[PDB]
Subunit: 366 residues, 3 copies
């Protein structure tokens, strides 16, 4: 039976720490420098406590429902508190305990994306209720559908590190929320930590320290750089000069955009995706006419990256190639469907979360 | 003869960097945001210079006296400046040079815990003298007794990553010291860096990227989260609302509490230890009626974690199981003895350090 | 044919992230706390955008020209956008894609060293032109000459991690530039991030998680500590007391000094190099009578470290030993020649870069 490779174990445990670093303190500092000074402490507390919450719900039943075998939409409850998972159990080429952790850290950053932006306007108890409802009914099923052998994966959707599961999912939850900068060095510091942590996020998604991890690593460097330049150029063009926030936004734009594509594309596709994503991101926030503008970058770039993954995975364009019997035509259709499903699923669940919270403790911070 | 495993080498070198990160700048920023603004620069200088000092004393004779073979209390001086340690020498499944580094980084964070808190009130030269005396007569012997085949290990004490060697040892040295917040975003940033670095501290204590490292990794995530929630709950209960400092303290509480237990317990035990530690930590600082309050968390949670390791390592409770012929009765007795010995040994040595310093250069900062 | 070792792949990918961390946000925060408050945002933007630029030029033709086979001074253009590099291509004991990334990250920090210091006084477009010219005509050829089988390597120059390619190269470019602290906690934070990232920089230069990486790791810890103490001592001696900036400068001094020597020397040589470098660094900045003073540390310590590598690599002094038939006499001569060549090559190219920029868009910020 399958034996764990210590090199992959090492890599994946370090990658998980890097993803945890994206939340604690990555996203917290990113939002901290953007929101009003008088709201920072509170937001920092909300991100820390909800992070703890997600970690616990993950171990208690999150992992089992997301990654256990079940149906197209959710797993099972046979892994409650990781029961039935032998310590030496192997998943892929690493111990399953590591997969649990790595996957849990993706749940954390996703929630951090939402809470950091909404902390200012939402009541503490309301956010806890929302987190519980949305992690359970949206994050878990979508993670199951994309990486848990569910509906989307079973139809061949390409999403290496979560353009759907993380970015689009959270962008929509945050935008439903919105519908209902004092420290730029701080924003930069959080952007930097997100960037560095993102190497575990993207490369670690290979599940092994192989050539695919190497590819995702290089593409991340390339798409992020291309997006910083694309954004900055659009900014110099529209506003006459680049800005620090523009540069950070650009980096996030490329990072988000390359997320679903990193392990399937060539460096050439990474450069193109990065440029398009930096520009689309700028167009995005511009059109979005607020820290919630952030969901404009995550949502627009997540959609763009997911669609472009269906183009650039082509052998012809330097990608690793589409699956057997799959054309670019067919693949693009599947990407569009995965995006639509994600937008609607997250939107509805988010609307139910906020509404439930509003009905139980009241949303609007007292 | 024993051959080094490159995966373990990679893992352990990365884990050492993560532990170094806990001090530089982890603990420095944690204390930096807590102490008075006018004292920050000085404290930062004291932590940096004493960190350099510990690194040098470690290589010169620290490692040899802690990890060389000798007696129940200390090693030998056959590894002065690492002489007699062939470059290719293997310790466990990694090169010995890596073990030297990894172990040295534990000495560093321990000292950083003490210096960051006392920098404000202690004279520079006095702290250097104290560091020399206490690292040499307390840290080294206790490290030798617990992880160097000394008295405590030879009696079967369980302490995976240093609830005694690091936490209790330093909590007591700091409290003897005490007997003789302006920037909360900064406190949060240091807490976050401590958390992330703590993965190398805890997981790296397996000495290999195996299932025990995976277990320690997951338990760290779980106990920290459980402690953040336990603390926050106690805070909402006693003070009417959670606070940022409460959330950070909770995280430190769970981290400290799970330190001796991480590699021996189940995730269920990790959750219970985390909750108890977050609450005990809150009770601790509360009773301690000052940045020195920090020693209340490290000391109380270190004791709690060490005792609970003697309960939760039981197979019955999801642990890896006690050693052959050892009962929970017998094990708890050994944990209590290791704690008592650590409290007294560190207390006496710390008292001698401060007193010597006071007699030579005067303690009270001029 | 050569097969990739996943442990080395893991290690090298994590080491690359650590080197990227040195720039984003390491050096940016180091300079951020040193320069005038009103110039921080701009400098941060310049470092971010030029970082993106270097990443792109690297992939487009940088890597190919630096590491492809060509002549003594530069490589070739057969690896444009990494064409002809099969995804599974192995370089040493890791996938070539990882070598590309790791090497690109060295290009980044080198440029960050220069831009962070000069951002204040240089026009944005002027710095972009300068970066393009200097990366292309100085960084690339020197990287090729030292690590790309060029002139210096082919004559046996010892420079494990870049005392010439990075430190001296950038110190000179910055000093030619100069010829034409408001937040010390911030300076400390950047110093700390540089330190931690430096473990990937130095250890990762072994290209594998072996005993040489272990040696470089330990030596880095030792030389940095020795330099912090040497600097601080010189400061207490000359100025009556240590300072936070002194402590950070000392750390950078030891880090720089041990860079070319880390993989060839014994810990004893690391301690001596560290002390000499901390003192030489202090003497340096002192003599330099400004954030550009930083080039005094990088340049003086880079020269010192490079020369001392020719002494301490000797078996007699605990080093790994000089190559067959090479004496310390002969080796020191080669070190001096590599330093001279680097100083002049970088100086001339830098002078041409600034001048071209000045002639095209004007240097002096409007």
């Amino acid at each position: 039976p399958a034996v764990a490779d210590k090199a992959d174990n090492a890599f994946m445990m370090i990658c998980t720490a890097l993803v945890l670093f994206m939340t604690i303190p990555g996203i917290a500092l990113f939002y901290g420098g953007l929101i009003r000074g008088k709201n920072v402490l509170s937001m920092l507390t909300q991100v820390t406590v909800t992070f703890a919450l997600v970690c616990i719900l993950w171990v208690v039943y999150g992992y089992s429902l997301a990654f256990g075998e079940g149906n197209n939409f959710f797993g099972n409850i046979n892994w409650l508190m990781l029961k039935n998972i032998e310590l030496t159990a192997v998943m892929g080429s690493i111990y399953q305990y590591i997969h649990v952790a790595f996957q849990g850290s993706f749940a954390c950053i996703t929630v951090g994306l939402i809470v950091g932006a909404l902390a200012e306007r939402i009541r503490f108890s309301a956010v806890l209720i929302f987190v519980v409802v949305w992690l359970t009914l949206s994050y878990i099923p979508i993670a199951h559908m994309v990486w848990g052998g569910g509906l989307l994966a079973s139809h061949g959707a390409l999403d290496f590190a979560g353009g759907t599961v993380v970015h689009i999912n959270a962008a929509i939850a945050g935008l439903v929320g919105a519908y209902l900068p004092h420290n730029l060095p701080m924003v930069f510091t959080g952007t930097a930590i997100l960037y560095i942590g993102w190497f575990g996020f993207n490369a670690g998604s290979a599940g092994t320290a192989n050539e695919i991890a190497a590819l995702a690593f290089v593409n991340t460097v390339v798409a992020t750089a291309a997006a910083i330049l694309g954004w900055i150029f659009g900014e110099w063009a529209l506003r006459g000069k680049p800005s620090l926030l523009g540069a950070c936004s650009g980096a996030i734009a490329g990072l988000v955009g390359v997320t679903p594509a990193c392990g399937y594309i060539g460096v050439g596709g990474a450069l193109i995706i990065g440029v398009v994503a930096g520009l689309a991101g700028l167009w995005g926030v511009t059109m979005l006419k607020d820290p919630c503008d952030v969901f404009g970058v995550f949502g627009v770039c997540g959609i763009v990256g997911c669609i472009m993954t269906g183009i650039f995975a082509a052998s012809s364009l330097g990608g690793v190639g589409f699956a057997e019997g799959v054309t670019m035509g067919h693949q693009l259709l599947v990407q569009l469907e995965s995006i639509a499903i994600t937008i609607v699923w997250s939107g509805v669940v988010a609307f139910i979360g906020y509404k439930l919270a509003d009905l139980t403790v009241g949303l609007r911070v007292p």
